[PDB]
């Protein structure tokens, strides 16, 4: 269907087809050489150059080589520099360039390629949508938002733009504003809208405004395979891990870790209090829009399986204690952190990103009344010197209505059914 051959390339189609047939048969090394010779003999051929780039792309896949792929990314760019490139080929080549740049984490490079695409094809709405994704991936929600505003001003019912616009509104705490965009966008069924992130945030925005339809959207998201269940809505999962809101120490197998936390709880408490008193700036306010109201701050010792050396200067005995337990200090999908919460706090129902961790809470200073935590359909309270364990990939919710502060110590561990192989290979979160 796409017209890839300019006038000259039609005259060498027999040679171009022969080289591409080698690639399609999986003879990647031969195909590379065939297209390289065509590039040698016909240096201005866009199809020979795209053939070279595609073969390098395949070769990078075969060798699992970032460097080979960087070569392909450059050759895709070379295509665009040649004279007389057909429009369909120019778009295919630069789009693949951007896609592979994103794969490598070259987000600024992808952004430049996407900006070029939009300049070359100013009426192509899909390319503007791709540009918005480029901004989202580099953390530039303001420019992403302007992009989807421009798309929606020309094509108001573009469902891809609606769900991404809604995602951005939601992330900016424009909850009510986000719901119709997320909802209409999912309902469009446009390509790219059947995505767990949009079900997740539509249901959550509805929950925050008291719309009871939320769980109908969680049910649909479960039925379409985005969530393990209506209750457990994490999006970075290893399928099949035992799924249970509340866990006993014995069920986790981390009984030595729990015994150490409980036997030594006062030293952990005392270093947390010393930081509250003498280094309170180490407690950073929660920053993921998870509070309806109130004051909640966290002092993080480990994140993504990496020790914060400076934080551990503030709690050196606690960091020494925990170094003996790599099931938490090496949990690259978890943290180790103090968590202080003050009266008048309500934490919105929410879920963590991954079913690959369980979350331990050690009580340090627990007022006798007013503090509780719900996970799924079950609500509990903390006790000083005692560990609670839940799976925070289940929806959970917290209230602090005491008359003084409440301090806990949060210790994430790898899910106990994950093998050492899985724990070494999962991307950090």
């Amino acid at each position: 269907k796409p017209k890839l051959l300019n006038k000259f390339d039609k005259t060498i189609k027999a040679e171009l087809d022969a080289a591409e047939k080698l690639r399609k048969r999986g003879k990647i090394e031969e195909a590379v050489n065939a297209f390289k010779e065509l590039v040698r003999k016909y240096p201005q051929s866009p199809r020979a150059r795209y053939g070279k780039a595609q073969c390098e792309d395949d070769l990078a896949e075969k060798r699992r080589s970032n460097e080979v792929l960087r070569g392909a990314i450059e050759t895709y760019q070379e295509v665009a520099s040649l004279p007389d490139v057909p429009a369909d080929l120019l778009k295919l080549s630069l789009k693949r360039r951007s896609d592979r740049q994103q794969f490598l984490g070259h987000m600024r490079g992808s952004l430049l390629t996407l900006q070029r695409l939009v300049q070359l094809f100013p009426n192509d709405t899909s390319l503007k949508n791709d540009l918005g994704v480029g901004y989202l991936l580099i953390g530039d929600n303001d420019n992403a938002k302007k992009v989807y505003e421009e798309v929606l001003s020309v094509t108001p019912n573009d469902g891809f733009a609606k769900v991404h616009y809604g995602f951005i509104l939601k992330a900016q705490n424009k909850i009510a504003e986000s719901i119709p965009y997320l909802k209409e966008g999912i309902e469009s069924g446009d390509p790219g809208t059947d995505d767990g992130r949009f079900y997740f945030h539509l249901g959550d925005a509805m929950q925050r405004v008291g719309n009871k339809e939320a769980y109908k959207w969680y049910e649909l998201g479960h039925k379409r395979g985005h969530f393990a269940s209506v209750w457990q809505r994490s999006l970075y999962n290893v399928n099949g891990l035992k799924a249970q809101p509340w866990w006993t120490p014995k069920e986790t197998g981390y009984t030595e870790l729990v015994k150490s936390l409980e036997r030594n709880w006062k030293l952990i408490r005392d270093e947390g209090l010393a930081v509250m008193d003498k280094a309170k700036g180490l407690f950073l306010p929660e920053d993921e829009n998870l509070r309806e109201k109130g004051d909640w701050s966290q002092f993080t010792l480990w994140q993504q399986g990496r020790r914060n050396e400076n934080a551990c200067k503030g709690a050196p005995k606690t960091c020494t204690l925990l170094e003996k337990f790599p099931e938490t200090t090496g949990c690259r999908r978890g943290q180790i952190k103090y968590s202080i919460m003050h009266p008048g706090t309500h934490v919105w129902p929410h879920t963590g990103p991954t079913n690959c961790r369980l979350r331990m809470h050690l009580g340090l200073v627990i007022p006798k009344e007013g503090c509780k935590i719900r996970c799924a359909n079950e609500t509990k309270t903390w006790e000083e010197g005692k560990v609670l364990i839940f799976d925070d990939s289940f929806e959970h919710e917290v209230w602090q209505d005491a008359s003084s502060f409440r301090l806990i110590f949060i210790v994430d561990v790898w899910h106990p059914e994950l093998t050492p192989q899985q724990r070494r290979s999962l991307p950090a979160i």
């Binding site: 990078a60 699992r64 080589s65 970032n66 792929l69 994103q102 794969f103 490598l104 984490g105 987000m107 994704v133 989202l136 991936l137 953390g139 995602f167 992330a171 992130r197 997740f200 945030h201 809505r233 994490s234 999006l235 970075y236 929660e286 993921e288 829009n289 998870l290 994140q303 993504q304 943290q335 929410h350 879920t351 963590g352 990103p353 991954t354 925070d392 991307p427 950090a428 979160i429």
Partner: peptide, 18 residues
């Protein structure tokens, strides 16, 4: 931004190729 407690970022993992 990192997805520490929630799922608020567009992507929670880093891209580093193969």
């Amino acid at each position: 931004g990192k997805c520490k407690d929630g799922l608020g970022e567009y992507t929670c993992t880093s891209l580093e190729g193969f």
